[PDB]
Amino acid sequence: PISPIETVPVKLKPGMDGPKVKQWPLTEEKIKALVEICTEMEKEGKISKIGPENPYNTPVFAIKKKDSTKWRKLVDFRELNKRTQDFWEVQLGIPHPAGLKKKKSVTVLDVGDAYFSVPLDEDFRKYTAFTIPIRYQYNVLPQGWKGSPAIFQSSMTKILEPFRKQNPDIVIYQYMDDLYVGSDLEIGQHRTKIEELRQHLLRWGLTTPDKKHQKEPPFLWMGYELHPDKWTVQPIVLPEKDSWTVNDICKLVGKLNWASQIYPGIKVRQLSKLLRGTKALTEVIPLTEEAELELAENREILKEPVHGVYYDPSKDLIAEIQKQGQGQWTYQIYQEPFKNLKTGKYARMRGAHTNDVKQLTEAVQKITTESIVIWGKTPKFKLPIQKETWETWWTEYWQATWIPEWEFVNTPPLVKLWYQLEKEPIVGAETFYVDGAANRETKLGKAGYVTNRGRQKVVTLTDTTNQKTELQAIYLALQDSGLEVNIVTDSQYALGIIQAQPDQSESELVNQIIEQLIKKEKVYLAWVPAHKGIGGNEQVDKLVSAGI
Amino acid sequence: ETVPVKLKPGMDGPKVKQWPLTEEKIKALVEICTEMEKEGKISKIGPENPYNTPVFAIKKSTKWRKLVDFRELNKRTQDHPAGLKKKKSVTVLDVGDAYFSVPLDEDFRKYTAFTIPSINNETPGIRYQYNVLPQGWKGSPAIFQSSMTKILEPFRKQNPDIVIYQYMDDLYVGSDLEIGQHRTKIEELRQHLLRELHPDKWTVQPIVLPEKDSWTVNDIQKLVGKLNWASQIYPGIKVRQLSKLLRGTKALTEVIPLTEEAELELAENREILKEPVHGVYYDPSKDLIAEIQKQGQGQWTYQIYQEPFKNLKTGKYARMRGAHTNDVKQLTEAVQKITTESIVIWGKTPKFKLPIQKETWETWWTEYWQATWIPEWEFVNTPPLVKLWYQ
DNA sequence: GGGCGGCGCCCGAACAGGGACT
DNA sequence: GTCCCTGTTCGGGCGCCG
Ligand SMILES: *P(=O)(O)OC[C@@H]1O[C@H](n2cc(F)c(N)nc2=O)CS1
Ligand SMILES: [Mg+2]
Ligand SMILES: [Mg+2]
C-alpha cells in the first residue's frame, strides 16, 4: 500500500517550471516491463493517469536488477532535478559492520518497492509526468528525482520513531530501506518483535517481502556477510585485463580501496600515480613497472581469507599503524590482539614537501575521526615511532601537533627524522653565503655562494625562477661543502622548506637537497634579510646578480 | 510576540555539514534535544529545509550544554564599556537561558536548522529547527536587549559602580571590590536573575633583545634580522651601525666586539622597544586579526591587530608544562583566553590565524572548548621567522 | 546504456594568500 | 601591482550501499 505518513512539501526553485522533455524509443522487453509495472501501480494509486491538463513530460526507462526478472523503473529527471529546490541530505555516512555490537538475535529485512510506498506532495505531482509508447503522473516518490532519497530516509525515520520509542533496546540499522534488527532477546521473543515490526511497518504502508527476510546467518547486509561472531566482505573481483585504460584503473583502484577496509596491506599509490594529467577514461595508460609490482602484491593479499569482528564496548579500541613506502600507511583497528575490527589505508599526499612524522600525524587524525564515526570514541594507538622521535619533532616543529594516547611498537620501518638542523652555528666548519637571482623576462638565473675561506662559485640556469635559484644555491653549497657546513640564505622560502625537515618532495631539486642533507654530519642554516648590505650575503648577491 | 529578521541581502542561510560527534556528545545532545522539543523550544524538520549548522556539546559539572556553531548564520544575519577592561575582577555568567522565552520569527526559523547524528550512521541524521531565540546567535542578545535592560535596571541603580556588559550569551560583571564580597554581589545578581577574570592584571608582551657580553657573526646577523623586521613596527629602529660590523665574509662563530656606535645603537633600540606603538586606532568596521605563534615548551605568543604591524595588543600564554602536554588543548585554551580579552577590551571576537593543520584542529578542538561563543579562524602554515621575532 | 542520494578515493582546475621583484 | 609557489575547495571519474 501507500504510507499514511504526511507528505513533505517540495517547491521548484525560485521562478521555474516543470520539465518539457520528449520521450525516446524503448525496446519491446522494456516496454512490456514498464507497462506491467504501470498498470500494477495504477491499480494501487501510486500513479494517476493524466490527460491534456498536464503540459509537462520527462523520459522513462528501465534496467535489469540483481534479482532475475524484476525490472527497475527509472525516470531521467535531470531537468526536473535542476529545477527542484535544494534539500539537506540526511544520510550522513555509511554504517560499518565493525561498529555493530554482538546481539543475541539478528534479522535483516528489506522494504519492498520502498520509494513507491511513500506519498509525494500533491502540488508537485504534475512535474513528474511521463508517457509510455498512455500518460501517467507519480503520486509516490519516483526513482531518479533528487528529492527521493532524502525524503524516503527522513520518512522512514519518522515511520520507525514510535517502534524505536517503544523498543529503545532493539537496534535497527536503517539504511535506505534495508533494515538490520538486533536484540538481546531469545530467538523466539525476537521473532515475535520482528513480526511486531513488520506489522508496524505495514501499518505505515511499508511491506517487507518474505523473499528478502533473512532469518538465519549468514546475513547479507551492506556488501557484507554477517555471521554470529565475525563478518566478511562479499567477494571482490579485480579485473585480470592486459590493456589497462583510465576507466579500468579507476575500477581497479576503487575495488582495492573497498577491499582495504578488511584486507591488510593494500597499496594503490603506484596505480593511482598512473592517472596524472589524463585525457579521458578511454585512454590506455601503460602499466609502469612499480604499478605492476604493486598490483601483483595486492592480488596476493586478496587471495587470503580474512574477517572482521564485532565491537565490544566494554573493551579498548586499538589502532596500529604500519608504514609502507612512498607515503603509504596501513592500519588495523582491533580490541583483542589478532582479531581486527577492521583495517584501512592512509596514502594521501598533503603538501609539496613533507616527512614521515607529518604523514603519521595525519594518518592518526584520519583514523581518529573515522573511529569517532564508527564507534563514537577515539582509539589508543600503536605506532612505529619512538617516543624520543616524537618528542624531538613536537619540540622543534613550529606548528601545534598532537597524537592521542599511544604506545611505541617495534615493527619496522620505524618512522624517523632523517636529519637534524643544528640549533647553533658550527665552529670551524666552512660558512657558505648563498643566493640566487632570476630574470623574470628571460627566465635565466644564477645560483651560487661565497665562503669565509674565500671560495666562490656561480652556476647559471635556464628556464628558472627566483625560488628555484635560491634552492639551487643551497643545493650547490651542500654539494661543495664538507660533512659539516654553515649556510646563510636570504630566502625564507627555502628556509621554511628545509627547517620543516622533509624527507620527500614532489620537486626533484628539493629531493637532491634532502639527499645531501641526509649525507651531512652537521648542518646549520641561518637567515638574513636580503639587500641590506649584510656582510657575506652582499658579495653573493653581487655575484649572482651579474646576469640580471 | 515576535520580531521579524531578514538575512543580509544577496545571502542564503547556512549550509554547513555536521562533523562527527562522540558517543557521549551525541547522547547528551539527544537527551537535551528531547527536553527542548518537549518544551516547544525546537521542532523536528526534514530534508526540505535546505539549511544546516553544526551542533555539539560541552561539559563545563555533570550537566552538558548544547552549543551551536552559528558562526556562519551570524555572518549572514542582518546587522561598549571602555571601563570594563579596568575592573579589579570580572565574572562571566551564562544567561543564554533567557533567550528560550522569546519566540523566534517564523520565517526565520528555517535558518537555525541543525542535525543530530548517529553512531556509525545507524540512522539518518535527525534534524531540528528553533522556535525561540537560539543561544549562540548574534540576533539573540539584540532582540532580548530591551528585556535585559529592564531586568538589570534596579541592579545597576543599586550598584552604580558595577559594570554589566553583555556579549551574546554571557554577562561580564566588573567590579573593583575584593574577590570575596565580589562573589557575594555576583550571587546577588544571580538570585536577582530569576525573572573569574582580572583585566587590571593583563600585560603587554613587548619585543626583547638578547643581552650578551660576547657577540658572534651569527648573533649579530640574527639581531640585525630581528631589528630589521621590528623596524616595520617601530620606525625608530636603526641597524646601519650594527650592520656595519658585518662587512666582509666571516665565519658564523667568529667573535665580533661591538664598537661604541653599535653599543649605543643597541641601547637606543632597546629603549625604543619599550615605547608604545604610535598611531594604532581601533576600527569597529574591521575584523580583529589574532596571530598565535607556538614558541615551544608550552609557550605561546600572540598579536591582535587589524592592519599589518598595527598591533592593538601583544601577549603570551605561558602554561609551563613539559611532562605530558597537549599542543591542541593549549592552543584552544589560548584561543579562548585571547577571545575573552578581546570581548572585554573591544566587544568583538578576533579572527584567529592558527598555527595548526586544519584537520588536527578540527579533530580535537571541541574536546577542550568551554565558551559559549566560537571565533572565526583560518589555518596558517606560517613561517619560523615571525616565530623567532616574538620569542 | 542511461536516473538518484550517501560515503570513500584520487586528480586537476578555480581560487586565496604571501614573498620577492622592478 | 606580477610571477611563483603553496594550500584549499570543489567537481569529475571510479568504487561501495541502497
Ligand atoms: P535495495 O532496495 O534493497 O536494493 C538492492 C540494490 O539497490 C540498488 N538500487 C536501489 C535503489 F533504491 C536505487 N534507486 N537504485 C539502485 O540501484 C539496486 S540492487
Ligand atoms: Mg635573494
Ligand atoms: Mg631609523
Author numbering:
A (entry chain A): 1 to 133, 142 to 556
B (entry chain B): 6 to 65, 68 to 86, 96 to 211, 233 to 428
How do the authors describe this structure?
The post-catalytic complex of (-)FTC monophosphate ((-)FTC-MP) incorporated into DNA primer of a dsDNA bound to RT, extends our earlier structural findings with the pre-catalytic complex. The overall structure of the post-catalytic complex of RT together with (-)FTC incorporated in the DNA primer does not highlight any significant changes compared to other structures of RT in complex with dsDNA and NRTIs. The Fo–Fc difference electron density in the N site reveals a double conformation of the incorporated (-)FTC-MP inhibitor. Copy A of (-)FTC-MP was refined to an occupancy of 40% and copy B of (-)FTC-MP was refined to an occupancy of 60%. The cytosine base moieties of both (-)FTC-MP copies maintain only two hydrogen bonds of the classical Watson–Crick base pair with 5-deoxyguanosine (5-dG) in the DNA template. The α-phosphate groups of both copies are in hydrogen bond distance only with the side chain of residue D185. The copy A of (-)FTC-MP establishes further interactions, its primary amino group is in a long distance hydrogen bond (3.4 Å) with a water molecule, and its oxygen of the oxathiolane ring is interacting with the side chain of residue R72 (3.4 Å). No electron density of any Mg+2 ion is observed. Moreover, the absence of electron density for Mg2+ ions indicates that (-)FTC is less susceptible to excision mechanism. The RT post-catalytic complex with (-)FTC-MP evidenced that the 3′-OH of the preceding nucleotide is attacking the α-phosphate, validating our hypothesis that (-)FTC needs to undergo conformational changes in order to get successfully incorporated by RT.
